[PDB]
């Protein structure tokens, strides 16, 4: 039970990475830039910081 | 009639523990045809002290009989296994289930039992309570009538351990009804899709302006028996009616009676506060005195 | 026969002590493993279990005539079975520490109940033979708590104190709003802008002085008219 | 107890450890094949099934 | 008897996670949308009625896990994709309470009755997420008539104010992408709809551009305004 709460904090981290992998099956750019900008329009700067990291990285 | 030689005393203090939570032991046989517990009739254990547990264990099995009725009643009225009971009928059970876990936390602390008296005398005060708390609903009142039965039962003080638990049941069962009060006097939205309280449509014809509604009647059409909530719903129930009629005319152009009296005058204060808005709304739109002089 | 006598004391039937329910008894002593002296004391031990089930019928009739003080008298009577049932579980560990102790200590604990249990049974029999209804149970128990027997005079004062609390409820709610919270009109104030109210002598306790009754009535009538 | 603490790390690293979980889709649910033990480990190893399936993705 | 009870509490613990138990096998109806549990034979009907009152919490847990794993087959831009992933957060929270129950299983302190009292607050929570998830699956509502369906489910719930508070959080997480698309349509004038996420017609006497394909759950005056 103590290892649950030390894995409950990745359960916020990896599950919003699972919403990231469900959006893009393809690897073509351009539509990837419209993908992560549809995730920075959501609020809540918990994963919004994380989707801003890739928004600086898919734009790069 | 003789059956066999005695059991042990430590087997007795565990068998009374099972019948309290609603589980049969080796000596207890639940009979669904009578909805009661049954001990064996004869010389089987009956009392290491001769033939005494044969009567004492029946007094606590009957005390164990009323507990499995309350858990039976709570599971059958939930709106995930039924769709014909009221919301006020559901809210009475929601306060009952908080009383059930207090029974479960107390029955789990009875070890280590010494003898059969030390446990029944601890539950002698609780024995009067469970006998009350089951057969108030078993008649069959429903909804606002069940809400009317419980306020009378919370009014029955000279009991001081049965009064706060029914006061708490009045606090919980009035939560859906008081939710339908403030949405009706501040916006005028009717909220329940299935309730004990009768539903009127208030359909207005477009051609005639008669009273913005053109028919309402009443849901309690002639008897008008709004019951058992604060003010006692004998005058202010007729005026939460009329201020509920006029809020949507603005739109589209120590004692159970003393705490009842503490909700009462705020419910007198806000209806007069909504009534003093529709007097001002008549002033700004009718211009009635100029029409009065014209007639 | 340790468990047979604690459980003949709880009031449930047997086939040695055959019992139908709540009123009738057959002794049925063709028993080989008790002595002719030892069945005489089981009749002494059953007489303290007979009035205990003459007691639960007084519960289930009122809990689960009529009046708001009948079940106010019920949470007085649960307190007199509460050290009784507390004594029933202390005999249970007596039968587990050594299961060879004979019945005379159980006789000894029930000679302690021998002057509590008839002395309340004569009270309820005098209650039901006058056909009492309302405040006059509280006056009947007040001249019953006029008696002595120092364990029992506190017990009929505890049954007095709980239904005096329901009296204490009434004149508290009557003086806050002016609301007469009665259903079977079980109060001496009765409805007789002003809206006159009246007295009632049969619902008035006689140990409360008679000139005090209109001091709550007329002031309570005047808070009702506002 | 501790053998289940070791069993969870191996599906955190990848695919199954002590026992065979036979599931690569919708969660990597853990089967012990034991019924005399409590029900309590089945929900816990269901949650570590989820996080092992999340990292396999 | 107590060793066979500690036998049971581990088999109970296996079905809380959504895992096939040891002596309780699961028979799929159409693929475990509704689970028909096959518990082992009894030599005592006392413990049979104890496990019988526990299995409705896994019946309701099987419906929500069937639906939120059907959201992976709902892989588009829709409000059902954000509703059930927020339901996965509630299923993540449901697994925290079981891991604390397993953290209580570090020694013997539990029976069939003890954890049954602990499953009582989560039983009404699981049964209301069950009735929502099966009602979204039958008609296959899409978008704002979805929000009209959840609002009748909120209206049908009215009462138990602590637990209409939960499905109030359920319906506004479903309305959370439905509101971010609206501010572009009401404060910028250009819409961004992935797959019919808002009601829109494409833009002289051109046309009316009247549209009601989503039906926002409130009254009809807002959808024209």
Curated annotation (Swiss-Prot), chain A:
It is found in: Cytoplasm, Cytoskeleton, Microtubule organizing center, Centrosome. Necessary for the recruitment of gamma-tubulin to the centrosome and for the formation of a functional centrosome. Belongs to the TUBGCP family. Interacts with gamma-tubulin. This is Gamma-tubulin complex component 3 homolog. The lineage of its organism: Eukaryota, Metazoa, Chordata, Craniata, Vertebrata. The gene is tubgcp3. The chain holds residues 364 to 423 of 906 of the full protein.
């Amino acid at each position: 039970r103590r290892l649950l709460v030390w894995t409950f904090d990745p359960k916020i981290r990896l599950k919003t990475l699972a919403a990231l992998v469900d959006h893009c099956q393809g690897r073509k750019g351009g539509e990837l830039a419209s993908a992560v900008h549809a995730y920075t329009k959501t609020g809540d700067p918990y994963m919004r910081s994380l989707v801003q990291h890739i928004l600086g990285l898919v734009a790069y | 009639q003789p059956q066999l030689v005695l059991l042990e005393e430590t087997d007795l203090v565990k068998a009374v523990l099972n019948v309290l939570i609603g589980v049969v032991s080796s000596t207890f046989s639940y009979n669904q045809a009578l909805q009661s517990f049954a001990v064996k009739q004869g010389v089987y254990i009956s009392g290491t002290s001769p033939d005494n547990v044969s009567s004492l264990l029946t007094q606590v099995a009957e005390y164990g009989t009323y507990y499995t009725r309350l858990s039976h009643f709570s599971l059958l009225t939930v709106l995930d296994s039924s769709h014909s009971n009221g919301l006020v009928f559901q809210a009475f059970t929601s306060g009952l289930r908080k009383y059930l876990q207090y029974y479960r936390a107390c029955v789990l602390s009875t070890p280590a039992s010494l003898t059969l008296l030390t446990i029944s005398f601890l539950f002698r005060k609780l024995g009067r309570q469970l006998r009350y708390l089951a057969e108030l609903c078993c008649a069959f009142p429903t909804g606002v009538k069940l809400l009317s039965y419980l306020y009378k039962e919370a009014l029955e003080n000279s009991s001081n351990e049965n009064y706060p638990v029914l006061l708490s049941l009045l606090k919980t069962s009035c939560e859906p009804y008081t939710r339908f009060i403030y949405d009706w006097v501040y916006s005028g939205v009717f909220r329940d899709v299935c309730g004990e309280f009768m539903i009127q449509v208030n359909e207005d014809y477009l051609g005639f302006r008669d009273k913005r509604y053109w028919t309402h009647g009443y849901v309690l059409i002639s008897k008008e028996v709004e019951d058992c909530v604060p003010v006692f719903l004998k005058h202010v129930a007729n005026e939460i009616y009329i201020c509920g009629k006029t809020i949507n005319l603005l739109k589209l152009c120590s004692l159970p009676v003393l705490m009842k009296y503490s909700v009462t005058a705020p419910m007198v204060s806000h209806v007069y506060l909504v009534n003093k808005a529709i007097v001002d709304y008549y002033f700004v739109e009718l211009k009635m005195e100029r029409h009065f002089e014209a007639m | 026969m340790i468990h047979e006598l604690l459980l003949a004391l709880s009031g449930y039937p047997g086939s040695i002590f055959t019992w139908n329910k709540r009123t009738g008894l057959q002794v049925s002593q063709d028993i080989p493993f008790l002595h002719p002296g030892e069945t005489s004391v089981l009749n002494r031990l059953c007489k303290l279990g007979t009035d205990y089930i003459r007691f639960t019928e007084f519960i289930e009739q009122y809990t689960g005539l009529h009046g708001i003080y009948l079940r106010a008298f019920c949470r007085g009577l649960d307190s007199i079975l509460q050290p009784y049932r507390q004594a029933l579980l202390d005999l249970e560990q007596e039968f587990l520490a050594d299961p060879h102790l004979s019945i005379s200590h159980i006789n000894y604990s029930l000679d302690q109940f021998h002057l509590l249990f008839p002395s309340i049974m004569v009270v309820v029999e005098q209650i039901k033979s006058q056909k009492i209804h309302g405040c006059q149970i509280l006056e009947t128990v007040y001249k019953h708590s006029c008696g002595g027997l120092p364990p029992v005079r506190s017990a009929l004062e505890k049954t007095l104190a709980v239904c005096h609390g329901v009296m204490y409820k009434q004149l508290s709610a009557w003086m806050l709003h002016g609301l007469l919270l009665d259903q079977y009109e079980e109060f001496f104030v009765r409805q007789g802008s002003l809206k006159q109210f009246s007295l009632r002598a049969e619902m008035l306790p006689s140990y409360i002085p008679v000139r005090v009754a209109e001091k709550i009535l007329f002031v309570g009538e005047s808070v009702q008219m506002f | 107890e501790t053998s289940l603490v070791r069993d969870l790390l191996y599906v955190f690293q990848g695919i199954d450890g002590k026992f065979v979980k036979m599931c690569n889709s919708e969660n990597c649910y853990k089967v012990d094949g034991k019924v005399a033990v409590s029900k309590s480990l089945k929900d816990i190893t269901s949650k570590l099934s989820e996080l092992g399936w999340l990292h396999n993705k | 008897l107590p060793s066979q009870e500690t036998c049971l509490v581990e088999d109970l613990l296996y079905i809380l996670i959504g895992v096939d138990g040891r002596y309780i096998s699961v028979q799929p109806l159409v693929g475990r949308q509704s689970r028909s549990f096959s518990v082992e034979q009894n030599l005592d009907s006392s413990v049979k009625e104890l496990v019988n009152r526990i299995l409705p919490v896994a019946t309701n847990y099987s419906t929500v896990t069937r639906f939120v794993e059907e959201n992976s087959s709902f892989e588009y831009g829709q409000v059902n994709h954000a509703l059930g992933a927020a339901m996965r957060t509630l299923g993540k929270e449901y697994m925290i309470l079981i891991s604390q129950l397993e953290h209580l299983q570090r020694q013997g302190l539990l029976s069939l009755q003890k954890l049954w009292f602990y499953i009582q607050p989560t039983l009404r929570t699981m049964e209301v997420l069950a009735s929502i998830a099966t009602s979204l699956n039958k008609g296959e509502c899409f978008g704002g008539a979805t929000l009209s369906l959840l609002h009748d489910r909120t209206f049908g719930y009215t009462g138990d104010s602590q637990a209409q508070e939960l499905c109030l959080y359920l319906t506004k997480a479903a309305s959370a992408p439905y509101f971010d698309i609206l501010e572009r349509w009401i404060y910028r004038g250009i819409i961004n709809d992935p797959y019919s996420e808002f009601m829109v017609e494409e833009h002289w006497d051109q046309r009316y551009t009247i549209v009601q394909q989503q039906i926002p759950s409130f009254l009809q005056k807002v959808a024209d305004k």
